[PDB]
mmCIF file with all atom_site columns, C-alpha atoms and ligand atoms in Angstrom:
data_model
loop_
_atom_site.group_PDB
_atom_site.id
_atom_site.type_symbol
_atom_site.label_atom_id
_atom_site.label_alt_id
_atom_site.label_comp_id
_atom_site.label_asym_id
_atom_site.label_entity_id
_atom_site.label_seq_id
_atom_site.pdbx_PDB_ins_code
_atom_site.Cartn_x
_atom_site.Cartn_y
_atom_site.Cartn_z
_atom_site.occupancy
_atom_site.B_iso_or_equiv
_atom_site.pdbx_formal_charge
_atom_site.auth_seq_id
_atom_site.auth_comp_id
_atom_site.auth_asym_id
_atom_site.auth_atom_id
_atom_site.pdbx_PDB_model_num
ATOM   1   C CA . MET A 1 1   ? 36.031 -15.834 10.163 1.00 18.99 ? 1   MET A CA 1
ATOM   2   C CA . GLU A 1 2   ? 36.160 -11.962 9.779  1.00 22.95 ? 2   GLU A CA 1
ATOM   3   C CA . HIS A 1 3   ? 35.950 -10.326 13.137 1.00 21.37 ? 3   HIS A CA 1
ATOM   4   C CA . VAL A 1 4   ? 33.569 -7.495  13.019 1.00 20.48 ? 4   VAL A CA 1
ATOM   5   C CA . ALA A 1 5   ? 30.780 -7.115  15.582 1.00 18.52 ? 5   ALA A CA 1
ATOM   6   C CA . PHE A 1 6   ? 27.149 -6.520  14.663 1.00 18.09 ? 6   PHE A CA 1
ATOM   7   C CA . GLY A 1 7   ? 26.231 -2.922  15.360 1.00 20.19 ? 7   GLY A CA 1
ATOM   8   C CA . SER A 1 8   ? 29.822 -1.612  15.341 1.00 19.87 ? 8   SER A CA 1
ATOM   9   C CA . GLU A 1 9   ? 29.923 2.174   14.949 1.00 17.80 ? 9   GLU A CA 1
ATOM   10  C CA . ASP A 1 10  ? 32.320 2.199   12.018 1.00 14.23 ? 10  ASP A CA 1
ATOM   11  C CA . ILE A 1 11  ? 31.053 -0.942  10.288 1.00 11.68 ? 11  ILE A CA 1
ATOM   12  C CA . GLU A 1 12  ? 30.703 0.729   6.891  1.00 10.32 ? 12  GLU A CA 1
ATOM   13  C CA . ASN A 1 13  ? 34.442 1.569   6.828  1.00 6.61  ? 13  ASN A CA 1
ATOM   14  C CA . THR A 1 14  ? 35.388 -1.992  7.785  1.00 7.00  ? 14  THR A CA 1
ATOM   15  C CA . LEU A 1 15  ? 33.132 -3.579  5.153  1.00 5.67  ? 15  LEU A CA 1
ATOM   16  C CA . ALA A 1 16  ? 34.304 -1.275  2.409  1.00 3.34  ? 16  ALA A CA 1
ATOM   17  C CA . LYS A 1 17  ? 37.467 -3.548  2.007  1.00 2.54  ? 17  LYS A CA 1
ATOM   18  C CA . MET A 1 18  ? 35.613 -6.855  1.555  1.00 2.55  ? 18  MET A CA 1
ATOM   19  C CA . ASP A 1 19  ? 34.797 -8.681  -1.654 1.00 3.41  ? 19  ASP A CA 1
ATOM   20  C CA . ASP A 1 20  ? 32.027 -11.230 -1.787 1.00 3.62  ? 20  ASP A CA 1
ATOM   21  C CA . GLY A 1 21  ? 34.324 -13.971 -0.340 1.00 3.38  ? 21  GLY A CA 1
ATOM   22  C CA . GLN A 1 22  ? 35.288 -11.911 2.689  1.00 5.03  ? 22  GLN A CA 1
ATOM   23  C CA . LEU A 1 23  ? 31.669 -10.976 3.341  1.00 3.13  ? 23  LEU A CA 1
ATOM   24  C CA . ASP A 1 24  ? 30.971 -14.706 3.628  1.00 2.00  ? 24  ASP A CA 1
ATOM   25  C CA . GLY A 1 25  ? 33.238 -14.860 6.680  1.00 2.00  ? 25  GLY A CA 1
ATOM   26  C CA . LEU A 1 26  ? 31.077 -12.529 8.820  1.00 2.00  ? 26  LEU A CA 1
ATOM   27  C CA . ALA A 1 27  ? 29.264 -13.793 11.940 1.00 4.65  ? 27  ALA A CA 1
ATOM   28  C CA . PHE A 1 28  ? 25.985 -12.154 10.812 1.00 8.39  ? 28  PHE A CA 1
ATOM   29  C CA . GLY A 1 29  ? 23.896 -11.763 7.656  1.00 7.21  ? 29  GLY A CA 1
ATOM   30  C CA . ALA A 1 30  ? 24.789 -8.942  5.273  1.00 4.71  ? 30  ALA A CA 1
ATOM   31  C CA . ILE A 1 31  ? 22.943 -7.674  2.225  1.00 3.00  ? 31  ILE A CA 1
ATOM   32  C CA . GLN A 1 32  ? 24.035 -4.710  0.100  1.00 2.75  ? 32  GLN A CA 1
ATOM   33  C CA . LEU A 1 33  ? 21.191 -2.919  -1.740 1.00 5.68  ? 33  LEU A CA 1
ATOM   34  C CA . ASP A 1 34  ? 21.183 -0.135  -4.315 1.00 6.67  ? 34  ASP A CA 1
ATOM   35  C CA . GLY A 1 35  ? 18.833 2.822   -3.746 1.00 5.51  ? 35  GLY A CA 1
ATOM   36  C CA . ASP A 1 36  ? 16.035 0.993   -5.584 1.00 5.50  ? 36  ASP A CA 1
ATOM   37  C CA . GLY A 1 37  ? 16.331 -2.048  -3.338 1.00 7.05  ? 37  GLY A CA 1
ATOM   38  C CA . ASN A 1 38  ? 18.068 -4.332  -5.811 1.00 8.39  ? 38  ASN A CA 1
ATOM   39  C CA . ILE A 1 39  ? 20.398 -6.853  -4.220 1.00 7.88  ? 39  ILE A CA 1
ATOM   40  C CA . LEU A 1 40  ? 24.122 -6.321  -5.013 1.00 6.08  ? 40  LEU A CA 1
ATOM   41  C CA . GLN A 1 41  ? 25.698 -8.617  -2.383 1.00 4.29  ? 41  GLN A CA 1
ATOM   42  C CA . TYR A 1 42  ? 24.177 -11.347 -0.162 1.00 5.01  ? 42  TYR A CA 1
ATOM   43  C CA . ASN A 1 43  ? 26.418 -13.341 2.174  1.00 6.43  ? 43  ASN A CA 1
ATOM   44  C CA . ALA A 1 44  ? 26.512 -16.937 3.341  1.00 4.85  ? 44  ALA A CA 1
ATOM   45  C CA . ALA A 1 45  ? 25.322 -16.241 6.881  1.00 5.37  ? 45  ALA A CA 1
ATOM   46  C CA . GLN A 1 46  ? 22.209 -14.504 5.480  1.00 6.65  ? 46  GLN A CA 1
ATOM   47  C CA . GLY A 1 47  ? 21.462 -17.565 3.362  1.00 5.93  ? 47  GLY A CA 1
ATOM   48  C CA . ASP A 1 48  ? 21.823 -19.764 6.465  1.00 6.94  ? 48  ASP A CA 1
ATOM   49  C CA . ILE A 1 49  ? 19.149 -17.661 8.226  1.00 5.78  ? 49  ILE A CA 1
ATOM   50  C CA . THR A 1 50  ? 16.651 -17.381 5.310  1.00 5.06  ? 50  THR A CA 1
ATOM   51  C CA . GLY A 1 51  ? 17.239 -20.414 3.145  1.00 8.84  ? 51  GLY A CA 1
ATOM   52  C CA . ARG A 1 52  ? 17.872 -18.343 0.003  1.00 11.96 ? 52  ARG A CA 1
ATOM   53  C CA . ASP A 1 53  ? 20.804 -19.292 -2.233 1.00 10.09 ? 53  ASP A CA 1
ATOM   54  C CA . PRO A 1 54  ? 22.985 -16.131 -2.357 1.00 10.09 ? 54  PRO A CA 1
ATOM   55  C CA . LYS A 1 55  ? 23.959 -16.352 -6.045 1.00 11.50 ? 55  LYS A CA 1
ATOM   56  C CA . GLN A 1 56  ? 20.326 -16.775 -7.036 1.00 8.84  ? 56  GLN A CA 1
ATOM   57  C CA . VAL A 1 57  ? 18.986 -13.585 -5.343 1.00 12.91 ? 57  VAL A CA 1
ATOM   58  C CA . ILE A 1 58  ? 21.659 -11.132 -6.514 1.00 13.59 ? 58  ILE A CA 1
ATOM   59  C CA . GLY A 1 59  ? 20.002 -8.823  -9.025 1.00 13.11 ? 59  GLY A CA 1
ATOM   60  C CA . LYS A 1 60  ? 16.498 -9.342  -7.664 1.00 15.41 ? 60  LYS A CA 1
ATOM   61  C CA . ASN A 1 61  ? 14.561 -6.582  -5.919 1.00 14.10 ? 61  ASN A CA 1
ATOM   62  C CA . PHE A 1 62  ? 14.479 -7.229  -2.185 1.00 13.54 ? 62  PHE A CA 1
ATOM   63  C CA . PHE A 1 63  ? 11.132 -5.467  -1.502 1.00 14.42 ? 63  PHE A CA 1
ATOM   64  C CA . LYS A 1 64  ? 9.196  -6.546  -4.577 1.00 17.60 ? 64  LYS A CA 1
ATOM   65  C CA . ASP A 1 65  ? 10.490 -10.048 -5.275 1.00 16.11 ? 65  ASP A CA 1
ATOM   66  C CA . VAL A 1 66  ? 12.449 -11.630 -2.434 1.00 14.97 ? 66  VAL A CA 1
ATOM   67  C CA . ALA A 1 67  ? 11.043 -10.276 0.845  1.00 12.13 ? 67  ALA A CA 1
ATOM   68  C CA . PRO A 1 68  ? 7.439  -9.025  0.434  1.00 13.58 ? 68  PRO A CA 1
ATOM   69  C CA . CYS A 1 69  ? 6.940  -9.214  4.227  1.00 12.33 ? 69  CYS A CA 1
ATOM   70  C CA . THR A 1 70  ? 9.314  -6.237  4.458  1.00 16.07 ? 70  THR A CA 1
ATOM   71  C CA . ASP A 1 71  ? 7.192  -4.141  2.106  1.00 14.38 ? 71  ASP A CA 1
ATOM   72  C CA . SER A 1 72  ? 5.674  -2.179  4.980  1.00 12.49 ? 72  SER A CA 1
ATOM   73  C CA . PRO A 1 73  ? 6.174  1.243   6.565  1.00 14.71 ? 73  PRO A CA 1
ATOM   74  C CA . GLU A 1 74  ? 8.135  -0.532  9.344  1.00 16.35 ? 74  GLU A CA 1
ATOM   75  C CA . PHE A 1 75  ? 10.921 -1.807  7.043  1.00 14.98 ? 75  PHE A CA 1
ATOM   76  C CA . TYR A 1 76  ? 10.691 -0.581  3.413  1.00 17.12 ? 76  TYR A CA 1
ATOM   77  C CA . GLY A 1 77  ? 9.309  2.754   4.579  1.00 20.71 ? 77  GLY A CA 1
ATOM   78  C CA . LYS A 1 78  ? 12.423 3.321   6.725  1.00 22.70 ? 78  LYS A CA 1
ATOM   79  C CA . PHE A 1 79  ? 14.659 2.360   3.811  1.00 24.65 ? 79  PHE A CA 1
ATOM   80  C CA . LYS A 1 80  ? 13.051 4.659   1.328  1.00 27.28 ? 80  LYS A CA 1
ATOM   81  C CA . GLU A 1 81  ? 13.168 7.636   3.721  1.00 26.42 ? 81  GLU A CA 1
ATOM   82  C CA . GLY A 1 82  ? 16.893 6.949   4.181  1.00 27.40 ? 82  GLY A CA 1
ATOM   83  C CA . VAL A 1 83  ? 17.597 6.760   0.521  1.00 27.21 ? 83  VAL A CA 1
ATOM   84  C CA . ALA A 1 84  ? 15.634 10.014  -0.047 1.00 26.59 ? 84  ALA A CA 1
ATOM   85  C CA . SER A 1 85  ? 17.502 11.795  2.731  1.00 30.31 ? 85  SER A CA 1
ATOM   86  C CA . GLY A 1 86  ? 20.912 10.333  1.973  1.00 31.64 ? 86  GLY A CA 1
ATOM   87  C CA . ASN A 1 87  ? 21.425 9.109   5.563  1.00 30.32 ? 87  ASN A CA 1
ATOM   88  C CA . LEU A 1 88  ? 20.255 5.939   7.285  1.00 33.13 ? 88  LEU A CA 1
ATOM   89  C CA . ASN A 1 89  ? 21.172 4.261   10.575 1.00 33.87 ? 89  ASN A CA 1
ATOM   90  C CA . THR A 1 90  ? 18.482 2.293   12.325 1.00 34.98 ? 90  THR A CA 1
ATOM   91  C CA . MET A 1 91  ? 18.158 -0.962  14.242 1.00 32.71 ? 91  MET A CA 1
ATOM   92  C CA . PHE A 1 92  ? 14.964 -2.855  15.022 1.00 33.32 ? 92  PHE A CA 1
ATOM   93  C CA . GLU A 1 93  ? 13.528 -6.326  15.483 1.00 33.90 ? 93  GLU A CA 1
ATOM   94  C CA . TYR A 1 94  ? 11.432 -7.928  12.746 1.00 33.49 ? 94  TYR A CA 1
ATOM   95  C CA . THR A 1 95  ? 9.926  -11.329 11.781 1.00 34.22 ? 95  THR A CA 1
ATOM   96  C CA . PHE A 1 96  ? 10.692 -12.887 8.435  1.00 32.13 ? 96  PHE A CA 1
ATOM   97  C CA . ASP A 1 97  ? 7.857  -15.230 7.387  1.00 31.39 ? 97  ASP A CA 1
ATOM   98  C CA . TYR A 1 98  ? 7.646  -15.547 3.583  1.00 27.57 ? 98  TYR A CA 1
ATOM   99  C CA . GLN A 1 99  ? 7.938  -19.155 2.323  1.00 25.73 ? 99  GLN A CA 1
ATOM   100 C CA . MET A 1 100 ? 9.835  -20.014 5.517  1.00 26.84 ? 100 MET A CA 1
ATOM   101 C CA . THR A 1 101 ? 9.373  -20.787 9.198  1.00 24.76 ? 101 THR A CA 1
ATOM   102 C CA . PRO A 1 102 ? 8.698  -17.435 10.959 1.00 21.61 ? 102 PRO A CA 1
ATOM   103 C CA . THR A 1 103 ? 12.068 -16.266 12.222 1.00 22.34 ? 103 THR A CA 1
ATOM   104 C CA . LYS A 1 104 ? 12.663 -13.297 14.555 1.00 20.58 ? 104 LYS A CA 1
ATOM   105 C CA . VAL A 1 105 ? 15.747 -11.238 13.793 1.00 21.95 ? 105 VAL A CA 1
ATOM   106 C CA . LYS A 1 106 ? 17.514 -8.014  14.702 1.00 20.50 ? 106 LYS A CA 1
ATOM   107 C CA . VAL A 1 107 ? 18.015 -5.779  11.629 1.00 19.92 ? 107 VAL A CA 1
ATOM   108 C CA . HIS A 1 108 ? 20.520 -2.950  11.269 1.00 20.56 ? 108 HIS A CA 1
ATOM   109 C CA . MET A 1 109 ? 20.238 -0.772  8.186  1.00 19.58 ? 109 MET A CA 1
ATOM   110 C CA . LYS A 1 110 ? 23.040 1.652   7.446  1.00 18.19 ? 110 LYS A CA 1
ATOM   111 C CA . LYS A 1 111 ? 24.165 3.722   4.483  1.00 16.81 ? 111 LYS A CA 1
ATOM   112 C CA . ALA A 1 112 ? 27.350 2.418   2.890  1.00 16.31 ? 112 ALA A CA 1
ATOM   113 C CA . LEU A 1 113 ? 30.399 4.667   2.704  1.00 14.00 ? 113 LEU A CA 1
ATOM   114 C CA . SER A 1 114 ? 30.530 4.957   -1.021 1.00 12.23 ? 114 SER A CA 1
ATOM   115 C CA . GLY A 1 115 ? 27.886 6.103   -3.379 1.00 14.07 ? 115 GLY A CA 1
ATOM   116 C CA . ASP A 1 116 ? 24.337 4.984   -3.495 1.00 14.15 ? 116 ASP A CA 1
ATOM   117 C CA . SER A 1 117 ? 24.453 1.742   -1.582 1.00 14.16 ? 117 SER A CA 1
ATOM   118 C CA . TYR A 1 118 ? 22.879 0.608   1.651  1.00 18.52 ? 118 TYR A CA 1
ATOM   119 C CA . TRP A 1 119 ? 23.615 -2.290  4.023  1.00 19.47 ? 119 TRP A CA 1
ATOM   120 C CA . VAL A 1 120 ? 21.068 -4.538  5.740  1.00 23.81 ? 120 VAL A CA 1
ATOM   121 C CA . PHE A 1 121 ? 22.654 -6.592  8.557  1.00 21.61 ? 121 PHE A CA 1
ATOM   122 C CA . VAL A 1 122 ? 20.718 -9.375  10.262 1.00 23.52 ? 122 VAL A CA 1
ATOM   123 C CA . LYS A 1 123 ? 21.221 -11.670 13.255 1.00 24.45 ? 123 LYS A CA 1
ATOM   124 C CA . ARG A 1 124 ? 18.947 -14.053 15.123 1.00 25.90 ? 124 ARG A CA 1
ATOM   125 C CA . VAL A 1 125 ? 17.349 -13.093 18.401 1.00 24.26 ? 125 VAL A CA 1
HETATM 126 C C1 . HC4 B 2 .   ? 9.658  -11.464 4.316  1.00 24.92 ? 201 HC4 B C1 1
HETATM 127 O O1 . HC4 B 2 .   ? 9.032  -11.684 3.214  1.00 24.92 ? 201 HC4 B O1 1
HETATM 128 C C2 . HC4 B 2 .   ? 11.105 -11.624 4.528  1.00 24.92 ? 201 HC4 B C2 1
HETATM 129 C C3 . HC4 B 2 .   ? 11.797 -12.343 3.617  1.00 24.92 ? 201 HC4 B C3 1
HETATM 130 C C4 . HC4 B 2 .   ? 13.226 -12.428 3.528  1.00 24.92 ? 201 HC4 B C4 1
HETATM 131 C C5 . HC4 B 2 .   ? 14.066 -11.650 4.343  1.00 24.92 ? 201 HC4 B C5 1
HETATM 132 C C6 . HC4 B 2 .   ? 15.421 -11.572 4.195  1.00 24.92 ? 201 HC4 B C6 1
HETATM 133 C C7 . HC4 B 2 .   ? 16.047 -12.361 3.184  1.00 24.92 ? 201 HC4 B C7 1
HETATM 134 O O2 . HC4 B 2 .   ? 17.331 -12.302 3.017  1.00 24.92 ? 201 HC4 B O2 1
HETATM 135 C C8 . HC4 B 2 .   ? 15.239 -13.125 2.366  1.00 24.92 ? 201 HC4 B C8 1
HETATM 136 C C9 . HC4 B 2 .   ? 13.832 -13.161 2.554  1.00 24.92 ? 201 HC4 B C9 1
#
C-alpha cells in the first residue's frame, strides 16, 4: 500500500514518482487525463469503485466515451476551464450513474506537475 492521503497539498509531487504499478497501491481512485480528456493512467482502486477494467479504458476519452454523466458544467466544465487557464485545484461531491449502481463520491481534480496532464482522484463518501 502507498501511503499518500487523499487531498494532500503536495500530492502532485508525490505521484510524479509512481509508475502504473505503484499507482495501484493507493487507497483512493486515480485517473490521469491529457488536456483533451483522454485517459493516460487508471488505477486499481478506481476500477473497484466503477467496475471498469483499467487496461480497457486507457486511451478512451473520459468525457465522451467512458463517463458521459460527467459531461456537464459541474464536472467537465471545471476541467476545461482548468486546462484553458493552466491551473486546476478543486474538490467536490458527485454521483456516478452510467451503466452502474449510482455511487456518490468525493472528486479532487488537480493539475499534474509536469506538462499537460491532469489528475482526477476519487473516494467513496
Ligand atoms: C458517469 O457517466 C460517470 C462514469 C464514470 C466515472 C468514473 C469512472 O472512472 C468511470 C465511469
